[PDB]
Symmetry: C4
């Protein structure tokens, strides 16, 4: 769903004075054909008859005007009602798949002016918005909640396995028995989890005011996952990688590329051609994820640490004195990295 159309969907999202009107029209089983224009004068050729109101907009007035047939003309910002009961005559040569005069009129006029034309059918409790060559049929509020509510439950399930794979990876990390398969499997889950968040966004928008709780649940469930995936890529890619580079690696698998096991490892710098070999590829964490997350050391300074010790396993074996040898690591930091790592070793493993 194009961001171009999503802004127009926002005009009839729950919470807007326009949807309040459109809801009353549906509940009362009336029909409607609304033309949203920033200037009536520009479209005098397609607007015939009806009455010239040119009055302040109001959900109550639009509903009231929807009792007469014909089309109603509103300003684009929904602050003025220009006409009512007008006969819209769009270009008859414009292709339309619709079968009824009300919707054939709506599609054609939308395609012709580039303006938003809303058509509410009398026989069906449906709102159809026509923008460019787009046609968005408004889902019923309850359905959306029910759809969004499912998306969330699917997210929670994914988040669950993600956490499990992550806590298992942490154990192999602290024990230095991690394999490419372990890393990749974990990235795949995170990526899919974030892909589902993206595929759900449009519905969170069609919900307007009513998508509040959904945004909150989503944010609580995906809070640190991206920072976590970026750190994973930084720690497990074949050759040294920059924070920013990993972030592009994250976005790439969230949109373009498919998070396939063999595809991921490839993008991480490993030349594998069969998902089985992954189990046979040993790999060691640089220590970025643990240094930042646990040790609380800024990535900038973490670079200096990894620069000198190379891997988490080696960082794990340095004294509080060897750690201070690093630019950026004083006495406190040394304690940090050291205690937080020895603490995780005495618990997780």
């Amino acid at each position: 769903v194009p961001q171009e159309l999503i802004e127009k969907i926002k005009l009839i999202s729950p919470g807007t004075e326009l949807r309040k009107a459109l809801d009353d029209i549906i509940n009362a089983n009336f029909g409607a054909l609304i033309f949203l224009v920033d200037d009536p004068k520009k479209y005098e050729d397609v607007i015939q008859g009806g009455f010239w109101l040119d009055t302040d907009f109001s959900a109550e007035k639009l509903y009231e005007l929807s009792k007469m047939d014909g089309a109603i003309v509103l300003s684009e910002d929904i602050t003025k009602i220009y006409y009512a009961n007008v006969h819209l005559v769009p270009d008859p040569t414009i292709p339309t798949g619709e079968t009824g005069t009300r919707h054939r009129t709506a599609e054609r006029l939308a395609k012709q002016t580039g303006k938003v034309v809303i058509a509410v059918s009398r026989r069906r409790n449906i709102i159809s918005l026509y923008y460019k060559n787009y046609k968005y049929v408004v889902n019923q509020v309850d359905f959306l909640i029910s759809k969004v509510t499912q998306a969330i439950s699917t997210l929670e399930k994914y988040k669950d396995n993600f956490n499990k794979l992550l806590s298992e990876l942490e154990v192999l990390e602290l024990e230095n028995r991690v394999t490419l398969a372990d890393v990749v499997r974990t990235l795949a889950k995170g990526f899919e989890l974030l892909r589902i968040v993206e595929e759900i966004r449009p519905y969170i928008v069609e919900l307007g005011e009513e998508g509040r709780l959904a945004r909150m649940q989503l944010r609580e469930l995906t809070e640190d996952v991206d920072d976590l995936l970026v750190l994973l890529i930084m720690d497990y890619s074949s050759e040294e990688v920059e924070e920013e580079t990993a972030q592009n690696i994250l976005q790439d698998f969230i949109t373009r590329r498919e998070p396939s096991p063999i595809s991921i490892s490839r993008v991480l710098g490993y030349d594998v051609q069969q998902a089985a070999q992954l189990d046979d590829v040993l790999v060691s964490a640089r220590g970025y994820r643990l240094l930042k997350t646990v040790a609380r050391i800024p990535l900038s300074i973490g670079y200096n640490v990894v620069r000198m010790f190379k891997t988490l396993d080696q960082i794990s074996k340095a004294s509080v004195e060897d750690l201070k040898k690093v630019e950026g690591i004083g006495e406190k930091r040394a304690r940090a990295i050291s205690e937080s790592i020895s603490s995780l070793k005495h618990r997780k493993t």
Copy 2:
């Protein structure tokens, strides 16, 4: 939703005969305009024609009367039905955004008398309640259960993270590696979680008898959250703070101030102006939470233990003989404090 309006909302909440009648009227597609007065003689200027019934109220009777057009006058305690089919004539000078005579009349009368006036649209399946300058549109039962269900799940997600943070803080507390970030990070979550409860509160009232399960769940999810937050504050404020004093800090952040990371660290007496400075501020718990929570020690008595040992870290290394010196701590209290804390140590770390 002003508490003043909620009291009037209770009148048409699921479970009440009035709503029972109103639901009937909705199902049968009838309209209505109910005027609730404590004394008809006090409004004989706005009540006209109709029939004087002066009889006992009943969901069944109200429904029957709803088949007639016009208004129905009920007693404020919903025990009497005074008139039916009356013509209401309120102050015409009162501005109204409504467009239909039923609603125009409903809002003007309410705003003129301060009395409750309920309007049910004949064309829409909607109940509207006018009190002072308020207009409450009664939501369909299913929608609330839905919306309240979602809020519960939102609380759930928040409470989960709350738990992850609190348990992570505990681990740190036991290892005496706590920072200001860790503490503040936990309060914010706890604070947000209670704010959400607050915002849901009204809908739980708009469910009448149908908000029993929701009340039960909310209680199970928030049970000891407030106490826990009150305790976390007493242990981590810059300078010793009294119980009651911490509670106001708790309320303050639920309603007034926003649980913003830096705003919280300031309210606790830690002059900071940058959230990044937190990961560098070290802090030691007083021991109040653990003393009271795990060791079942009264806060007044806790004051002494903390006064003599200064930090949880020290209370943690205290011998039973050491703990006995403290005024109020007997031989049992000492074992209690001693054994309960060591038990955690061995388990959590």
Copy 3:
């Protein structure tokens, strides 16, 4: 809700050929007045006119017959349709609160014959069943699911805290630091949890075929809780108690008595009058719950173990040889009790 009425509710539960009919009648907005009799001849005085069909019952035929007005007379087992379009004339002296002839007729006739009379109102999408002095209005399927679904979520929340209190009690048990408050608090939660299961039963029935998944969720959530509460009572009551006695103690708090802290301990044999003293009452588990549950020793044989060692703490301190001194405990059992206890001590604490 009396079991007497619940059997009659089963006649129109989803899944029954009768509800299938009643659903079609609602969806088609028709009305109906169904009289369920085991013999028409007995009620010839109240059944006038209409047509004598005396034919096989069928959801399709009843729906079809519901298009004519008047009442339809069916056999009690829903296998025959005796009449249609009949005029039912019940006792006019029987008190009724109804206001319409269709429902005044239904109530009166139900009160008079003791038979089931179903009234479906044309204006409202509602099914009203009248049995004795009972009147059950059928809830809409979707609502029930939504109600039952909430009940379940409330159960899961309770089950959650229950498990937490239980795993915390297990720790104090293995460490022998349990107090009356610890035991009681845990019983209270379990009792309430089971009380909610009972208060939900009627809805699980009104759901018929559609309550399948709900029964399954309930059973998965409450599976071992009762056996667990019985064992708790056996281990923590002041004076030795029999399995059966505890079971009556369980049922009592699930129906009659209220699971109040001070009420429970009292029933457990402790003379307390203030919920605060509970924290000051030390108590030791006999070892029944652990011996049966973990050690797998039949309660009958567990009695012999408790008879000789008295408490779990002492059972916890016996050698594999001292344990064999008990009637019923050979070499294997000794290993059992011993290893399972030492295993829990090396993990939970």
Copy 4:
């Protein structure tokens, strides 16, 4: 639901133009009687009058035609609309339980030609699909999402218990204190959980494009359950069993036999006739699950380790040098088996 019928159900599943049209017809309260044939000339005896359109299908066109009375004839691939307003005349000798001419005609025609015939009642919001001797009443989208949502939660509860049991078994496995009850108790739960998936499968198809989230969740909840069960069987059957052989045992219990405690212990080769005898039967895992699952060792290679060490308990005490003797186990595999198992030991026990 025979797979034969599900293939025809796919035709009116959310996402298809036909259902799109059918939903329109439902909303506008129109009725319909659609006959799907691959060749009209083959049924010119049952098609009468009406209009010969022979045009391209379209959800919009079908809807338009639904305003006319009579039947509509479509091609089986839903790309052509042959007739509209036709009078269908099927074999009158075919018995039918239907009472209205539309449905009587619908069932007789379907049963006479083997072709699909869809009837939409004008009075009820219902779609009915007749194939052979089958009658599928299309459930309203919201209800399925609901019912499927509940089944997912049921799976959730089952999967939870599954997890509790499996992890409890693991603990026992590591301590070599496993009984036959513990093993069988776990399989039953695993078995029930997959049976439920099976029973839900059809509804997930009746959701068309709207069963994507449900498919995703189901996959996240059952992902490795089957493999896990296949492995638990290979480790605990009375006598060594081959992989494929265990899978049939798995299928057998999902479809045929019931996961009854005693029935399962018999299928595994443990002659028992009383569930109480189980708590007394001791059993030692082969080590296949742990070898393959945790130690990432192929089952074919696992055969050797198990062949030489007999039990997991022994594999567990095996040195790296010991593990190297086994054909197929190199220096890495040994460390893998050795380190991975010890890691569990230290963590789980």
